[PDB]
Symmetry: C3
Subunit: 455 residues, 3 copies
Amino acid sequence: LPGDFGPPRGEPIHAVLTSPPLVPPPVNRTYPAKVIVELEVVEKEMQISEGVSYTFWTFGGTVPGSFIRVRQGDTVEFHLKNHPSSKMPHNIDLHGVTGPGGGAASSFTAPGHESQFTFKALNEGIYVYHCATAPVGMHIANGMYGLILVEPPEGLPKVDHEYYVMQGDFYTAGKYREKGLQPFDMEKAIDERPSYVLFNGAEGALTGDKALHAKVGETVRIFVGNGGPNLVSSFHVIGAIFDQVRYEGGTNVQKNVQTTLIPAGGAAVVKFTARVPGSYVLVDHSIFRAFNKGAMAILKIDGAENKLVYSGKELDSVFLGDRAAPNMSAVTKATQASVSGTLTVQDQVQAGRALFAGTCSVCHQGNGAGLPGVFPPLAKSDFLAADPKRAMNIVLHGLNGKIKVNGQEYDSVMPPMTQLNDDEVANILTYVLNSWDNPGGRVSAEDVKKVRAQP
Amino acid sequence: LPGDFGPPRGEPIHAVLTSPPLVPPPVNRTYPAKVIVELEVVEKEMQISEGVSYTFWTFGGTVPGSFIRVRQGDTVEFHLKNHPSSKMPHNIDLHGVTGPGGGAASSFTAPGHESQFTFKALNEGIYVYHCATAPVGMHIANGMYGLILVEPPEGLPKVDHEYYVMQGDFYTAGKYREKGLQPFDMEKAIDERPSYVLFNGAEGALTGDKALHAKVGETVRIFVGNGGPNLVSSFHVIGAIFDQVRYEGGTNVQKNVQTTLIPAGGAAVVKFTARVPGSYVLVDHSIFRAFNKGAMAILKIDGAENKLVYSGKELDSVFLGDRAAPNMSAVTKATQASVSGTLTVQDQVQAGRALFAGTCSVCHQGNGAGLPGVFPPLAKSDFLAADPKRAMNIVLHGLNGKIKVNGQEYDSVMPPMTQLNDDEVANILTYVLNSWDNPGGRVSAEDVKKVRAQP
Amino acid sequence: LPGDFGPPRGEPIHAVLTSPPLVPPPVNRTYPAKVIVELEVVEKEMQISEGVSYTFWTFGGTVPGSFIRVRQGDTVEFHLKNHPSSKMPHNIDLHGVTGPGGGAASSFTAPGHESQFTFKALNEGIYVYHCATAPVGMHIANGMYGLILVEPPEGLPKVDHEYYVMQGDFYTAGKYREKGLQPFDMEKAIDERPSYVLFNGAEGALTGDKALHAKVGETVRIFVGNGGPNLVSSFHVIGAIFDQVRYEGGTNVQKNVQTTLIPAGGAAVVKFTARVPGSYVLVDHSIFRAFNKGAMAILKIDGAENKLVYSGKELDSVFLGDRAAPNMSAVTKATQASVSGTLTVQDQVQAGRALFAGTCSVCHQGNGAGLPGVFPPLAKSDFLAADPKRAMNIVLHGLNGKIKVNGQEYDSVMPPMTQLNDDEVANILTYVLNSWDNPGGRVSAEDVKKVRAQP
Ligand code: HEC
Ligand code: HEC
Ligand code: HEC
Ligand SMILES: [Cu+2]
Ligand SMILES: [Cu+2]
Ligand SMILES: [Cu+2]
Ligand SMILES: [Cu+2]
Ligand SMILES: [Cu+2]
Ligand SMILES: [Cu+2]
């Protein structure tokens, strides 16, 4: 059989698993070993977006699950534990396993139990693993997926950085950025109409202060998985090119491409060389996913500018919107304060500040000045101050036709922004009212709910 | 021109066409021939799922249509007959034909008529053929697609088994597994929201007793088509790897991959070597298709276990759900008995038995015992017996919070199963009531319809 | 760095940009140059379909935007102007640019302004460029995408014809072919449910008298982009095969394929050799896109028939429906006349004539004769004449069961055609009534609206 290099030798190895976005060290070994993998399923609430909770089902407490790294020809003794706090039974199917269910029938594990099975890793490559418990789509949609790397016997070529990025489509009862604990929505899942499309299980998991890092001149390998359950990723890096893309354990290697399709349940190894400094965006280039559902991750490159290659500026909020900033923690704080009934004006102002970036600043500017005659000012705006209820209607339903703001005529079009949630409109307008010599006061989520109910 | 090896020689050959999942023998020929292909369009009702009828439009009486096998450089004389019972006109477009419409303008055929056209098979490869009659999407959605293989002149490498598997997306007015004759739904088709995603034109067409077969050590070639009309298949084999994947007549061959994207209207040849015994599942890994819409097929491998490669068990209903069993004929029988007005308790019990597998057994076990303190028993359940109407509400709408069953406390969550149809809930609960010393009696589809109407 | 061949030499070149479907001449140069690209954003109403207006946002006044052609190693000085009539700010991200945002942060341009940035073209290949202004999906959905070709240093192999074809998905408030100025629909865009899927920004942009042309024996290169924003194209040529397909700047080249997947934001170079005369259809083979949403383009090959290769007829309206004809200008004229309140019977008749092709003629024939006993006549039809209101109901809601037409019995099924708009049903039936010795008169859109409101 391929990838059979004899029985295990040396000592049994306890696999060291890593949490995303990090990868275990290269196995750096010339002999086949018995590798003991211990993975524990944990069901738990986590933030899928600021102020939005979701009950994830996880391998190892993360989405995606712990990264497993072995060598082709290793005997893997796989232990799956199901934490006693679990409500569901779980199991595992690893791609790249040779045998029925990729482990599923022998890994069936009730809450508080443990199962084990053994397999030889015959197939080199990068592989998705996932839960295989009826209803299979529900388990995978709740975050039950990760990657296993089966190294070639000589190891992969040395790089400066290895990272772990996995896309998933998620199905909430509520709309995108609707606050609260969001249940799983089976109807959206069956229709393949996700509310979120994420890297590593949350909006902003790999942006701002959670960006991946490297330096000019360094090489980066990324193990990229698509857990699905349903979407195919038009996986793309903005402002850069992949030196190589290799799918699973495939013989074919594509070189010098920027855009590549990753099947549902598929995995690829990509390699990048950093040439110039700045933020490189990993996206699903089915563009409403990347810019309206959360499918964006950042690789931040530090080092010397090369004006002969690129004369231009670092990414800002015009392109990355509200993810240009280090974090949106102010949104989480305002949401918690609403729940507790302690929401202050300043809690709203700081949340609105975070959300104004891109969403409003692209036209009205970061300082609210606009552009005289083209985009009207929000800074010390007589039109804003004259009618705060009309301002709520303008955000939700748009504005067009001739208006006068601060003594100048505008005759343009502000598109409707009906996709903003009531708390988002309230916090943004509270921010604007409390900035730039505007009159202060506040807009409440209830205020906006009433305007939404009758335009 | 490529693939032109002179005029036809020998005798004219009458092509021998096969029904899925079988393929005609290798042409085994060193000379170009005149090949006469006779294909007849038949419109007819068939079971798309147990107790669910659909009017298919077929090439040769099957979905997918009869497999056509010729050699590169053959002159093909193509005869399309439209059966007199047909209501629609039909035609054909074969991929791999060199000429406008791939045959469409010269194959236009009214009910009870016959058309013919001739083409040289210049392009080697595996190709989709399909109907090309306005409205083209409706004809293809009704099952009007198949494969034509144009062998290379030296033939393909010898294998132990060749099979024919074709994916299709289907659009019923009714929901998944809603019983009766289901009309085509143009609105779902335009929106690309299929009710079924199938291999070979039915749920269970290639599962249980209709599985594909081979033995350990044997090689299997599968000609895989995607008739669409609309979906792209994340085509995957669970627990195995493809030795080779080749698309259409492409020069590129990918090797050692498990997951591959097949375009709408695309076709690939895959090759598999059986290493260990068990059931290998072919799926569209857009996972709600495979596990909620019917997109699963089985290759069953017989032979000696190899514990050094895989220590684990054969696939069961935890992963394959209600398709683990040889067939679900009891569902078809119960549906026919409802139509006739002769439905008995035992008809319901046998249907419920089939549907309980996976759907309920994953948590409550095949014997209804559950797991004390974790999953409550359905076997001799005081809680079930106390309130059969509450049991209908629990299946449709779920259950959570503290309950007492057979003297033990449970504090867990049973998800809602609202996607089950009224007859399915009725038959499952009738099965449970008539098993395991439960009190007997029955639940009717009308009973469940009323509970669904007011939770 | 790759593709760095020293500083620019010779004179600065002012790039000559072309409108689709044409491409600039090969750069035909042995030295790296400074290339000055000037591109202007124009927002403007254009016909997305006959009688259907849309406000496109364009690079250079077209969808897709002006084609840019440079050589690997050129220094590109990129000037983006935003026309003063613009309401939105715009920018650019070019795939294949090495640097953050592919130009986005340094190309931010308010109406009536100009921005510039410089980049070295290190990466050879074909690349999408698009707007990168929040909300990014809205800008791309409004048509803000095109192609840039970075030639290899020795140039591409010489061909007879080069063309420029780019797919896009579009999101109108109204349904497909609903007349009037159609606003952008953010809700459809987020759900990835386009109303139109087009080549080069309109239905019929590359059909009939706007077809691409070549002659038997000639080679055609097509630069194929997928602007998205959301869809993946199952890109296919009907009745022909691609000699080569190469994605972006990839090392891999696939040969001899008919069907290939182009990611959202992806681009490919395809090469075709014309073997026999006729119309070759480029489609997205997600078939409801091609035949129900506009995703069809034609390459028309003139020259000598080769009966040894293909004995069959040129494409007609059975396959291409209402796009078989040179244009559907009569629909545009009837729509304008309705708006003006000058709609005549003959305006309706000429519009109906155009729309009857395929839609009705596939069964009732181009002359309305039908096929005795199989498809009833519309020519001098007693059944039509007896009840014009019943004819409106038959088009919208279908007909089945026994009928008598012109003294012969029919017992067949005419499917419902509810997707036709009220003006389309009115114009088709006015055409039929005024043809073939039928009694004349007219059906109005208001007539059909009332029948639609109560079947
Ligand atoms: C450009 C695409 C804009 C974005 C994004 C947002 N706004 Fe806007 N806004 C814009 C225009 C062109 C106009 C004038 C419309 C016209 O009829 O000419 C406006 C107007 C407003 C107003 C009222 C006028 C004023 O006080 O300056 C308000 C209060 C306003 N806009 C607020 C606002 C907020 C809060 C935004 C993000 C949520 C936002 N706008 C986005 C253009 C654009
Ligand atoms: C796990 C994912 C389950 C599946 C699949 C099904 N059921 Fe279930 N069921 C489950 C739990 C954890 C509970 C207890 C909930 C709580 O509040 O603690 C239940 C409960 C029931 C009951 C009532 C209690 C009893 O009689 O044991 C019934 C009647 C029941 N479940 C039926 C049932 C059927 C018929 C199923 C398939 C259609 C099914 N359940 C699936 C967990 C799970
Ligand atoms: C085949 C797929 C058809 C298409 C496309 C259209 N029509 Fe049709 N039509 C068809 C049949 C088989 C029948 C008879 C149905 C039966 O019960 O046997 C009809 C009937 C009509 C009629 C009434 C009878 C007559 O006058 O001949 C009308 C007025 C009619 N059809 C019109 C019509 C138009 C305008 C179409 C395009 C919009 C059209 N039909 C499409 C079969 C088919
Ligand atoms: Cu699980
Ligand atoms: Cu899988
Ligand atoms: Cu047909
Ligand atoms: Cu086709
Ligand atoms: Cu723009
Ligand atoms: Cu892009």
